[PDB]
From Swiss-Prot, chain B:
Substitution effect: G88D: In dnaK756(TS); confers temperature sensitivity
Subunit structure as annotated in this protein's UniProt entry: In pull-down experiments interacts with CedA.
Lineage of the organism: Bacteria, Pseudomonadati, Pseudomonadota, Gammaproteobacteria, Enterobacterales
The protein, known as: Chaperone protein DnaK
Organism the protein comes from: Escherichia coli (strain K12)
Subcellular localization, as worded in the UniProt entry: Cytoplasm; Cell inner membrane
General function of this protein: Plays an essential role in the initiation of phage lambda DNA replication, where it acts in an ATP-dependent fashion with the DnaJ protein to release lambda O and P proteins from the preprimosomal complex. DnaK is also involved in chromosomal DNA replication, possibly through an analogous interaction with the DnaA protein. Also participates actively in the response to hyperosmotic shock.
Family according to the record: Belongs to the heat shock protein 70 family.
């Protein structure tokens, strides 16, 4: 006797639901959703995130509310800081961010360093403002821009992948005095400047091609100097 | 190196597929989304889909498909001991917890009875993962239309049964022509739920609400 008259919703009378999605801002200005809309309070989500660059001592938890992928197109609840992270390469540290909304509708956002054991913790309301004309306007707007939103997401991904290489190679440009051959660092310079201008923009794996081009130039020097 | 936060953290694995449970309508409700960093923990609250429901079946699904039959079943468990009540009343807290080793812990806890059941599933292959993602990509429109359809059906079903309860509440004080109209609208809606069209359903829901005002007040006065 398994599943019949055993089913599940999804809808619970005595409890509130989240009017619209809640999350944090991540590199590239992208909203990473933690608690999705129409989620029934109380709810809790705990997830690990990391620093966006090498030797980074601090991160800003930025709480966003909305269905848009672009952070700026989402309502910004509030933000706080967590510092005192032992330096380490980009992606190395482990920051546990937790969104816990209680029965009263109070969002408890916390960020913890799994290394130091240090945690900054705040509460904020998800229930303020709103007024469903607003909510519906927001979600409808999200429905309108959905394609552009997804495109933007993949774009940002490729982008940050490029930014990492930019910062890296630029930080790796001088291993020693004049160790890197002269006039190579010139073409390299025009290359990565033209890369900074390659992303203020829209497109594409074109950037990616530029990246796979700029990886193998100084790769000579660097690899032989390893 | 300014202030930012990257979602990608190395040394830590990531969910290959979306994980969730089967919910009313035969739809897969996602708790832990695809490409989420392990360890991760998500918790929500669910209720019964029916009145006087003494138990719930937690059916754990993995995949990007909206239909439950279109995803992978990781396991199931029954939670009994639930004090029979109207639907929506019981509070069943469902938790998905994937620890560092990649182990899935799914728990369900009835907050009234305090009784709790918990399963642990271990850790598909690259093929059939990419097959799943592929099927998702291909059928995405059909899936979305399906999810919307089941949302609408759920709405209309709540409306249907609550209205029927309102009728049963006072059927003696309810006018004959009014009763006939209401029951025609109910039968119409019930029939429309079995269909594939949203607009038809929300229409019949509308029309049902249009003739139900007297029923509302009369039910109240009892």
């Amino acid at each position: 006797m398994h599943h019949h008259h055993h089913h599940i919703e999804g809808r619970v009378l005595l409890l509130d639901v989240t009017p619209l999605s809640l999350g944090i801002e991540t590199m590239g200005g992208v909203m990473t959703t933690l608690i999705a809309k129409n989620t029934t309070i109380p709810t809790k989500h705990s997830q690990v995130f990391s620093t966006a660059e090498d030797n980074q001592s601090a991160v800003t938890i930025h709480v966003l509310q909305g269905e848009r992928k672009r952070a700026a197109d989402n309502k910004s609840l509030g933000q706080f800081n967590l510092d005192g992270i032992n330096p380490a390469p980009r992606g190395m540290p482990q920051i546990e961010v937790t969104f816990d909304i209680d029965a009263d509708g109070i969002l408890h956002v916390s960020a913890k360093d799994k290394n130091s054991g240090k945690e900054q913790k705040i509460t904020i309301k998800a229930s303020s403002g709103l007024n469903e004309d607003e909510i519906q306007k927001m979600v409808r707007d999200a429905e309108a821009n959905a394609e552009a939103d997804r495109k933007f997401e993949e774009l940002v991904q490729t982008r940050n992948q490029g930014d990492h290489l930019l910062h890296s190679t630029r930080k790796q440009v001088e291993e020693a005095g004049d160790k890197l051959p002269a006039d190579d660092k010139t073409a390299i310079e025009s290359a990565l400047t033209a890369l900074e201008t390659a992303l203020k923009g829209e497109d594409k794996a074109a950037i990616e091609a530029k990246m796979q081009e700029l990886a193998q130039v100084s790769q000579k020097l660097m690899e032989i100097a390893q």
